[PDB]
Symmetry: C3
Subunit: 90 residues, 3 copies
Amino acid sequence: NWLWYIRIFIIIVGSLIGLRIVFAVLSLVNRVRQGYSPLSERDRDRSIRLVNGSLALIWDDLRSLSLFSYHRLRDLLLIVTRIVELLGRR
Amino acid sequence: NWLWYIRIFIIIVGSLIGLRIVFAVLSLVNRVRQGYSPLSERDRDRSIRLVNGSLALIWDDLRSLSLFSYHRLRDLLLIVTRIVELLGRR
Amino acid sequence: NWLWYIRIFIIIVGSLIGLRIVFAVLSLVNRVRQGYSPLSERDRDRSIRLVNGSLALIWDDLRSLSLFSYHRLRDLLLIVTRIVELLGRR
């Protein structure tokens, strides 16, 4: 058989691109490891802090929108409507 | 499922990959929303500024190449050749 | 004139997904050139250094481990576990 061996392979490729998303997260790590501004070396000590920073990195977004349990976010959500109205008049 | 249903199924995955380019705009929002590099911020109001940022986002890249008009870009393009010539020099 | 053309097309579908990864490199350029924060451009002269930045960009990650003399990399590996070790305990 050829289709089956090559077919599952495509499914693996599909899995492969799902893997690519971590690179977005990697870029945050890259900022510190790769020096955000035009990179044209001590920060590795701080870079290891990214191990724990992985938990906090995803937490900043989760807590920024909601802050506390799924309830406080209702207050933050109103800001989105208010911002277009407020910005509408520079 | 059969190869026919799976054939297009593989094709959808092909569509899935292009979606990732759009994620790059998300990373700008994400890092700002994440405070900064390995954080282990008031700017959230500023993050929402990125809402209108869709217009400005293409403008930073668009204005960098030409700057102001769209004919000047021919002049700006010459700059890149000078960089390699100048940087290659002692 | 269907599955045969499509089977190789499937092969091409695999290659193109990996092509997308260079954009992560583009994101570094975009970060500074497109404004790391909600961009809602004289710095281009400085951004030009990012052109040669390609050589430096890969080296920050590679050179961080050893810094100087590959032998030094052996000592770096040990301290890396130590950092996590310190974090592991109160």
